[PDB]
């Protein structure tokens, strides 16, 4: 059974090196990741459909992020994602 | 439609301007916006009225609107 637990735990060590997390909390984090995954991917699919495009690219993901996230959360997520895609392309 | 056309159009253009420059609008986009705003206000006023009657009043007040909007989320 796959989950995001280990990646969440590594992130926890990045943000709080000496802090742990309970099993229930890790389950809540995994639920969270799946919800946001579904919301963004589904909305991006809808954008692509709306524009008669058959491919979901980083642009639909970016626009979905702008629709779903509030204010500074959307801008910060877009900045991180953009840096990541440009670094990947290099 | 119950709001006058031209002031709503002007409001739409003013509000739209602080997000992206040089926009134009299709006519049917503005009528769609008018249908949406007026439907929302009619429904919101319905909720305000239920909140007012709950408080044994017949006069709507700002506090009724804020309660309706808070419960709506």
């Amino acid at each position: 059974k796959e989950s995001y637990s280990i990646y969440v735990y590594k992130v926890l060590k990045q943000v709080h090196p000496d802090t742990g997390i309970s099993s229930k909390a890790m389950g809540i984090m995994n639920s969270f990741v799946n919800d946001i995954f579904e919301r963004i991917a589904g909305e991006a699919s809808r954008l692509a459909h709306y524009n008669k495009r058959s491919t979901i690219t980083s642009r639909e993901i970016q626009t979905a992020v702008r629709l779903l996230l509030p204010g500074e959360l959307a801008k910060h997520a877009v900045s991180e994602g953009t840096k990541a895609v440009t670094k990947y392309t290099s | 439609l119950l709001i006058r056309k031209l002031p709503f159009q002007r409001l739409v253009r003013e509000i739209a301007q602080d997000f992206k420059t040089d926009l134009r609008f299709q006519s049917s986009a503005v009528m769609a916006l008018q249908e949406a705003c007026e439907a929302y206000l009619v429904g919101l006023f319905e909720d305000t009225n239920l909140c007012a009657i709950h408080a044994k009043r017949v006069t709507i007040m700002p506090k009724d609107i804020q309660l309706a909007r808070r419960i709506r989320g």
Binding site: L47 | P7, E14, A29
Partner: protein, 69 residues
């Protein structure tokens, strides 16, 4: 420009909602509520427009915005 939604217009909307009497302070509140709603909807609509690489907000964008809230 928010002042273009006049007092009698808000009165007509209140009558359609079945409201018989309206406090003088309602009007500014309604204007504020309207501004917030409009801002939110148009933000989504224009976001969709930019995705389509268009400069014209279309009726489908607005309807789509309405659907997603």
């Amino acid at each position: 420009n928010i002042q273009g939604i006049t007092k009698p217009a808000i009165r007509r909307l209140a009558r359609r909602g079945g409201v018989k009497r309206i406090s003088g302070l309602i009007y500014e509140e309604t204007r504020g509520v309207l501004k917030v709603f409009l801002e939110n909807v148009i933000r989504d609509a224009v976001t969709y427009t930019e995705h389509a690489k268009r400069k014209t907000v279309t009726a489908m964008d607005v309807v789509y915005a309405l659907k997603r809230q």
